[PDB]
Amino acid sequence: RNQKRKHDEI
């Protein structure tokens, strides 16, 4: 199961 991506990530 994968990591959530924060807005910084986009």
Next chain:
Amino acid sequence: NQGTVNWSVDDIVKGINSSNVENQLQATQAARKLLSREKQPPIDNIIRAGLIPKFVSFLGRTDCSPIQFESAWALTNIASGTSEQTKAVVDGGAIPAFISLLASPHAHISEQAVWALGNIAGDGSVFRDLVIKYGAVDPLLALLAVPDMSSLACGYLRNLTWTLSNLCRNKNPAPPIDAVEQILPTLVRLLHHDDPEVLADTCWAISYLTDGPNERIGMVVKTGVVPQLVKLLGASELPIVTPALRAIGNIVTGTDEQTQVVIDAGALAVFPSLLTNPKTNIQKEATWTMSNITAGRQDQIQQVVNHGLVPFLVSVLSKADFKTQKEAVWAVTNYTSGGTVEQIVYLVHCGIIEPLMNLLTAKDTKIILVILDAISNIFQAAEKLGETEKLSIMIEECGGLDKIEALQNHENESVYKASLSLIEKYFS
């Protein structure tokens, strides 16, 4: 009795440094007028000259309201330029003086102080923490916390809201926690106002407070605001959609429990319109928001399915702009990585394969790998149903094999290995 419009900086300094009360005011207003034109406020000049701690002293003059007003404005406009400029204001000792001004019986003076504190805090985290440290929060909230805010002009309300927002704004470091706890209840309340600028300012504030560690997400969610955020997210006639969406997207980067507060408040029902919205930025942020939901538990992926959102993701993955397509990929990969076999079957039924494979010609390495991992995930579900051979032929007959073979003559070793593994395991 004079031409304050056409005074020089020299005239001002002599005026201020005079011991005569009227020339001091006159100078201070000449200052104000110069700083208030568009074409190059002589800001550096004024500092150079060593006036700031005089202006700061003027702020102290309860005896003379007009000189308080005129310096507040003057300082505000200084504080609205560069960090050095803003710093001069701070170095001068403006902050604690402005906070004293917040309780003036003259609203126009109080609100000028509010505006200045907004700019000081707007510089970044340091001056923001200084403004909080000197005690700005209680008096700012006192102006807004009310049985009578209704009696505040809208320009003032907007002004306060924007300043509060600046107090919530940057990171590295994020704002002190107990200041945030103190402020949040006002924000939650302002989220039920009707003025669109109040709403946007407070929504962006919530958005900032939700951008960080789970702990921060948690203090926001606990207020009970999230249903209200979802009502705003639905207001397609208003520009408030964007900040409400940012804040919701931030919330779903947290725990599964936090994500579940969003779902229970009923956010997913709004997404059909968010993913079809002509404003592409809203598409992207809704697809990003989706992707953190499909990264969540299986009962959460199931809610995404039950609300019919999967044909929408496919739609976006297929025919939207490349930035929004990236986010679509992330939603798919997370989905395939966490989903049940049934969930994966349904995704394939919705026509995920071809659009997903189209994006292997993307010139972005991070994204080729997650596409490959998603395909790899789909093949594992195919193993378990004994359909690997079927899935192989289909991928061969729609150009998918060409695009995977294409990747063996790629420069990145990882891309080369991942794609070779697929060819070996499923096309040998």
Next chain:
Amino acid sequence: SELAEQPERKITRNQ
């Protein structure tokens, strides 16, 4: 709008 974007960090009172 113009209200859809983040507010300005610093604002000057002009004119």
